Design goal:
This is part of a larger assembly, with 1 copy of chain A, 2 copies of chain B and 1 copy of chain D. Chain A is mainly beta. Chain A contains 1 helix and 3 strands, in the order αβββ. In chain B, the strands form 2 sheets. A 4-stranded antiparallel beta sheet of chain B has the order 1-2-5-6, with no helix packed on it. In chain B, strands 3-4 form a two-stranded antiparallel sheet. The chains are: A mainly beta, B mainly beta, D mainly alpha. The structure holds zinc ion (2 copies). Chain B: This is DNA-directed RNA polymerase subunit beta.
Chain lengths: ~100, ~100, ~150, ~190
């Protein structure tokens, strides 16, 4: 995302000819070096189990409706933990109100 | 609904030109609002000239009547006359609560 | 494109580009609009990247109907264009323009309409227009989050 | 470098634009008032108290318009075909002279966009004053251009044309006076 320093407008990319030169509707150009060459990308089985459920995992020990199991918490030694199942991979996560997160999630 | 939501500000632009002021004027702003409304219990005219005696539900069901309560409204009407050269003549009237 | 259509008394089946509605209320800078939608242009993330790129794509899409005011950064011109398009009883598109007071009447009526029609639960006063823009950006953010599955 | 509202710039703009200084200050606040009230300074709304005040966005749109079209005048040679407002200006100059506008014309945006965002959050009251001051500061920075001789006439006309376009459009959001409603070709007119 390139924004015009004067117009604060989105600039087209305009790959001409051997380089990348951004152009605004105001006629300004800023060009681009090295790190602007990424045209498009796609990563498979990524963006899942980190960004989709971060808030849900954080709030899970405080959710009354989450299922809980009898398992000792390593940190605060509470006799019960909150059991969490996410994804078509069925990843089981145990979280506690003390912040213990089972290093998974 | 009647008071807050039913406000009218409509302007008409005539073509009537039968008087000098009529030619000078091609506009009129009709503006009015209601501040009174109340539904009272159903009434029936016993002999078409009575004092609207009470209408009981079985009378409505038997006689095919509608068990409906009358709606009493009162409105404030503001009429503004718009002329050329910026003149503006306003006529205001207050209507008694009518049904 | 991401088109926003408002259906109420004064509006019907009229589809507006989102950035146009945003910059109708000032804030004509694209940076501000993208910040209103994605809530932050400075935290990279994987979600903000996708939303930012697709909002760019929506911004640069040429719609056939709102072409004259698509690239316009002038708030008054866009307000006039929408008032002309959406308000009835105005058959002459050129006769009224030569009168300044007719222009002012149309602009004021359109601004009052948009105050009363765009997210009325957010407020029905002109001082609540920026928080309406915040709420609309939040709605667009929620839709684009749902797109990500 | 610290910043403080320089009210002197606003008055200087008012004289050059032959409009009252209250008309300069009331940018973004013309709604709900007649134009006669704007110049009289009557019913001026209190300074903004929150970052969500639409006046802050309204004034910033005015500053953006000045910068947006100035860059069009800065980069007339870069356009495939220059816009109409600047076509009137540089119609009489050559292509080589058009390419000279980019270097000669100073860069006036400075750091308005970065400064405005911090002020809009930290001090909403001063965000309005800074934006208006910046709009006037750039105007006299344009208007007080002295050389080269050809660029004096081009810039001077543009600067006067721009703010008057900004003010007129800003004036067009004020209350409308008496006019013939028949100009819209139908039987009725609503509000
Ligand atoms: Zn630009
Ligand atoms: Zn624990």
């Amino acid at each position: 995302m390139k924004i015009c320093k004067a117009c604060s407008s989105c600039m087209v990319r305009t790959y001409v000819d051997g380089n990348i030169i951004f152009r605004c509707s105001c006629g300004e150009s800023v060009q681009g070096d090295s790190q602007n060459l990424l045209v498009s990308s796609k990563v498979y089985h990524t963006g899942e189990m980190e960004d989709k459920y971060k808030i849900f995992i954080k709030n899970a020990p405080f959710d009354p409706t989450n299922c809980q199991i009898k398992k000792d918490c390593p940190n605060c030694h509470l006799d019960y933990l909150t059991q969490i199942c996410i994804g078509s991979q069925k990843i089981i996560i145990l979280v506690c109100r003390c912040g213990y997160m089972s290093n998974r999630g | 609904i009647v008071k807050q939501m039913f406000n009218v500000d409509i302007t008409y632009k005539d073509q009537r030109d039968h008087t000098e002021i009529d030619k000078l004027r091609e506009s009129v702003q009709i503006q009015f609002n209601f501040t009174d409304v109340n539904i009272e219990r159903p009434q029936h005219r016993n002999y078409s000239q009575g004092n609207k005696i009470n209408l009981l539900p079985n009378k409505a069901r038997l006689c095919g009547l509608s068990y409906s309560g009358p709606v009493n409204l009162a409105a404030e009407v503001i009429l503004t006359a718009h002329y050329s050269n910026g003149r503006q003549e306003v006529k205001r009237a207050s209507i008694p609560p009518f049904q | 494109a991401i088109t926003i259509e408002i259906n109420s008394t004064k509006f019907s089946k009229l589809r507006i580009p989102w950035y146009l509605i945003f910059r109708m209320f000032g804030m004509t800078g694209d940076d501000s609009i993208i910040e209103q939608v994605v809530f932050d242009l400075e935290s990279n993330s994987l979600v903000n990247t996708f939303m930012i790129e697709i909002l760019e794509k929506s911004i640069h899409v040429l719609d056939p109907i709102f072409q004259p005011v698509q690239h316009e950064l002038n708030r008054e011109k866009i307000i006039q264009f929408l008032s002309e398009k959406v308000s009835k009883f105005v058959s002459n598109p050129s006769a009224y323009k030569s009168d300044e007071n007719a222009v002012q009447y149309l602009n004021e009526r359109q601004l009052t309409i948009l105050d009363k029609i765009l997210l009325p639960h957010m407020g029905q006063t002109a001082d609540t227009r920026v928080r309406k823009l915040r709420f609309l950006g939040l709605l667009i953010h929620k839709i684009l989050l749902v797109i990500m599955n | 470098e610290p910043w403080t509202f320089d009210y002197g710039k606003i008055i200087k703009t008012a004289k050059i634009l032959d409009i009252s200084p209250a008309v300069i200050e009331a940018i973004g606040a013309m709604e709900g008032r007649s134009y006669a009230d704007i110049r009289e300074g009557q019913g001026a709304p209190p300074p903004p108290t929150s970052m969500d005040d639409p006046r802050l966005m309204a004034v910033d749109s005015a500053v953006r318009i000045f910068l947006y079209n100035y860059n069009c005048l800065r980069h007339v040679s870069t356009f495939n075909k220059p816009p109409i407002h600047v076509e009137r200006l540089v119609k009489h100059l050559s292509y080589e002279e058009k390419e000279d506008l980019e270097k000669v014309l100073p860069n006036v945006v400075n750091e308005y966009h970065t400064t405005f965002k911090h002020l809009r959050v930290t001090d909403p009251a001063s965000a309005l004053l800074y934006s208006i001051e910046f709009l006037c500061i750039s105007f006299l920075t344009l208007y007080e251009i002295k050389e080269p001789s050809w660029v004096v006439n081009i810039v001077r006309e543009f600067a006067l044309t721009e703010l008057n376009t900004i003010i007129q459009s800003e004036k067009l959001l004020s209350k409308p006076g008496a006019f013939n409603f028949m100009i819209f070709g139908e039987d009725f007119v609503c509000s």
